């Protein structure tokens, strides 16, 4: 039933450690963002790797807080209001 493959994926992804974003899209996004502060900037590959690790760790922690909020509201589906509430309670918004 719906949610069985969801739990299979949850088990599979809490076991592995490999990066879940494709490398080239993230590099292109980083360069697009950086191009708005100074043109002709270069990035060591390790800088992009560190940025990707930090961004995924941040997003996973945020999704954990969002899941906590969603379960608090007695639901199962995470919603944008859950994200906004988590970011407000953290002190980010």
């Amino acid at each position: 039933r719906p949610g069985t493959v969801a739990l299979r994926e949850i088990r599979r992804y809490q076991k592995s450690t490999e990066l879940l974003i494709r490398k080239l899209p993230f590099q292109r996004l980083v360069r697009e963002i950086a191009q708005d502060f100074k043109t002709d900037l270069r990035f060591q590959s390790a800088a992009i790797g560190a940025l990707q690790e930090a961004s995924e760790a941040y997003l996973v922690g945020l999704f954990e807080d969002t899941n906590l909020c969603a379960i608090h509201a007695k639901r199962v589906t995470i919603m944008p209001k859950d994200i906004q509430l988590a970011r407000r309670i953290r002190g980010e918004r």
Partner: protein, 103 residues
């Protein structure tokens, strides 16, 4: 060496030089680097003990970042100490909420 005199494996001269060149104080007493080296050695010994236990638990003979992450997040005192650090290739602890489990 000064590590031998204190029965230590970490360097006393290196730590004294880093304290001297780090713009911490005008002068540095001789009992500070020994004490600090002992603390660092104790903490790394604890970390490596739990990480070796975690790696044997997975039946591996070499410690990877995953075992460091498991050892840190599994020990209450260490996890409180390293509460803000993220470990590359450390992953997350397996944790499924009670209400999401199937029925």
């Amino acid at each position: 060496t000064r590590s031998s005199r204190a029965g230590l494996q970490f360097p006393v001269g290196r730590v004294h030089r880093l304290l001297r060149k780090g713009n911490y104080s005008e002068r540095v007493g001789a009992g500070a680097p020994v004490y600090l080296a002992a603390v660092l050695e104790y903490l790394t010994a604890e970390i490596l003990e739990l990480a070796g236990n975690a790696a044997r638990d997975n039946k591996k003979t070499r410690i990877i970042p995953r075992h460091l992450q498991l050892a840190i997040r599994n020990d209450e005192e260490l996890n409180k100490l390293l509460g803000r650090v993220t470990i590359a290739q450390g992953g997350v602890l397996p944790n499924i909420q009670a209400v999401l489990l199937p029925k």
